[PDB]
């Protein structure tokens, strides 16, 4: 009984000195971005608001959160599969991104409405 204040803890993996630099890495949170940053990011990540997000590499835009399709299983001779995550923005930083299908692998806290 005890030592469980919150099941989801902020694992500081690439939060300090993540060093993603630019768009040479898959979208994921080591990232600390803002409401507008996402707005440039989809542009910056080659993704644009969508009716309904299901494509490899095309996602849907909302506000404090975007949705982003996760890099599928890809082969050289062959390419297929798709999975999508929901990508949230908390404050001036990226909140999370969650492969919606399993919604547990990453999994972080929701945005507090203002």
From Swiss-Prot:
<comment type="similarity">
    <text>In the C-terminal section; belongs to the transpeptidase family.</text>
</comment>
<comment type="similarity">
    <text>In the N-terminal section; belongs to the glycosyltransferase 51 family.</text>
</comment>
<feature type="region of interest" description="UvrB domain 2 homolog">
    <location>
        <begin position="23"/>
        <end position="114"/>
    </location>
</feature>
<comment type="subunit">
    <text>Forms a trimeric complex with MipA and MltA. Has also been shown to exist as monomer or homodimer; homodimer of Alpha and Gamma isozymes can be found. Interacts with UvrA, FtsL and FtsN.</text>
</comment>
<protein>
    <recommendedName>
        <fullName>Penicillin-binding protein 1B</fullName>
    </recommendedName>
</protein>
<comment type="function">
    <text>Cell wall formation. Synthesis of cross-linked peptidoglycan from the lipid intermediates. The enzyme has a penicillin-insensitive transglycosylase N-terminal domain (formation of linear glycan strands) and a penicillin-sensitive transpeptidase C-terminal domain (cross-linking of the peptide subunits).</text>
</comment>
């Amino acid at each position: 009984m005890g030592s469980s204040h919150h099941h989801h803890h902020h694992s500081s993996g690439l939060v300090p000195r993540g060093s993603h630099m630019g768009r040479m890495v898959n979208l994921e949170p080591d990232m600390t971005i803002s409401k507008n940053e996402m707005v440039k990011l989809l542009e910056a990540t080659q993704y644009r608001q969508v009716s309904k997000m299901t494509r490899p590499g095309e996602f849907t835009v909302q506000a404090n959160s975007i949705e982003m399709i996760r890099r599928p299983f890809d082969f050289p001779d062959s390419k297929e599969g798709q999975v999508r995550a929901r990508l949230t923005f908390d404050g001036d930083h990226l909140a999370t991104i969650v492969n919606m299908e399993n919604n547990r692998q990453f999994g972080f806290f929701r945005l507090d409405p203002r």
